[PDB]
Amino acid sequence: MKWAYKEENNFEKRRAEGDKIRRKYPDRIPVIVEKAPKSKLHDLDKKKYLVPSDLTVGQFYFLIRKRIQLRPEDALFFFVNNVIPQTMTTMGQLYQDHHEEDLFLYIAYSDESV
């Protein structure tokens, strides 16, 4: 998978905003959300999210569902390093275990489970 946020912003600029957010906004998690390729869902205009660390993955599912006009009756899976996070996990625990060298957390969503 290729991320549009990396194709539009190099590491030096991504890292700079990451160091910036991590210092000035310590209780916030910089998350990059992008649709996985070969998926038939709606694409999100807003890719950069500044969610609080107390926010849970279940709550993040709800926020993303409202922006693609998807109902709970539809399939929606989050992937981080090809691993589906649990709903109880906080976005802060996701960041600590899964953030990249640019200090951003990358989440992909799809309608498939693979």
Residues forming contacts to Cl ion in the complex (CB under 5 A) are 47-48
Least CB distance from residue 48 to Cl ion, whole Å?
4
Q: Which helix (H) or strand (E) holds 28?
A: strand 28-35
Closest distance to Cl ion from the beta carbon of 14 (Å)? 12
Q: How far is the CB of 106 from Cl ion (least distance, A)?
A: 13
- Rounded to a whole number of angstroms, the minimum distance from the CB of residue 64 to Cl ion is 14
64 vs 109: CA distance, rounded Å: 9
Structure tokens at 21: 């957010």
Residue closer to Cl ion by CB (options 20, 48) is 48
Residue 77, Cβ neighbours under 10 Å: how many? 16
Beta carbon nearer to Cl ion, 46 or 71: 46
| Residue 3, token pair as written in the block | 């991320």
For residues 1 and 36, the answer to whether their CB atoms sit within 8 Å is: yes
Nearer to Cl ion, 8 or 74 (CB): 8
